[PDB]
Amino acid sequence: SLKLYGFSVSNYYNMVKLALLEKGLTFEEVTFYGGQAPQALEVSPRGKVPVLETEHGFLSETSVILDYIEQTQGGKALLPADPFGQAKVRELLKEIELYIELPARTCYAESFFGMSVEPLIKEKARADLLAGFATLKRNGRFAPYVAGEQLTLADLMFCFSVDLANAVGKKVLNIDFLADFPQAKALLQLMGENPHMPRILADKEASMPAFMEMIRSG
């Protein structure tokens, strides 16, 4: 009965969507843009997307949602079998989220929505991203996947964060992070050949006009 609330232009939503698809699980998509409206905050407490509705109620936060799905659902494992290896996947997932996705996100207004961001914000984003990509290069195994030889949750955070982060680099900061990170470049192409990727990208394109109208409205 799992329901995934969010929208197909959301990168964090697509991470959960890809996990569900990779694991062959049944789910219903519900269009939800989150935000600060009182009715939105009742679904998602900080107004963030995605949210997973279960028999027990709503769960928000991609990393938390993925762990819940891994614990409770069947289908292909997206973690290794040993505790320390599981924690390494989660370490890499958290590094990409905190030190690549979130800093890149501070510039998405400029890179994607045509609205310049403050110089101080770009300065901090540049430093944080340089440090984030350096952490990933140092800690990632890329064998070929982020954590080693098998697809794991960390690869979902990677493939839907590093693409946008690189676009922010080239468009906003004059830096092509992937140009000198061939391990990462190879993985991004490899994740692009995932059999569920065409579905993800098709749904994203199909959903883009409504999302942009939502933007221009508020």
Place this chain on the structure above:
Amino acid sequence: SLKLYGFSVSNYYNMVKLALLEKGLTFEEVTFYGGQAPQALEVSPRGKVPVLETEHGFLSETSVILDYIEQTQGGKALLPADPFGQAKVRELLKEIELYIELPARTCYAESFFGMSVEPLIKEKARADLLAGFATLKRNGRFAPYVAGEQLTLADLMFCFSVDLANAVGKKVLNIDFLADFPQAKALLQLMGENPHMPRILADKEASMPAFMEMIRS
């Protein structure tokens, strides 16, 4: 065996320290300040503190270290047994980290280290902290603990984040967040009565001059 790398002034280090003490676990403390030095990056890949050393190698990131401890170690459980309840604890912990601790942290230079922060950063922190405290109010159960009737990992993130965020509020932003959040004020006093808190605070005070000296040079 377990070694905990970091320093007792670090709030993230203290969260893991408290989890280990609360679980009755043996561990060794190793003074480590992280940073961008090559030798430090070998231990902690983003240069952050704390890091746990296990028989298998180093793990960084407090939330990750706490989960690893819960999954592998003996002692008092700091999560409920049911998987949805565990996820709700982790949601609350993540929300405190991302929406309270990290925005507050953008202002620590001023609140703690005598270095004034830019207005743009102060105004962002104000709006983020107001929202993060609202999220915690609406999602937390405070019964009396963050997630319900029992102490969990989310209370560790809470008791070592919300103290500092309130200090930022009063000193930097002219807002006392806890003044209108009685369930949180009450929880913070309860956590302060934990039998391991005096050791944590004494170690912090003892470690302060060396930390400040590292900062100066």
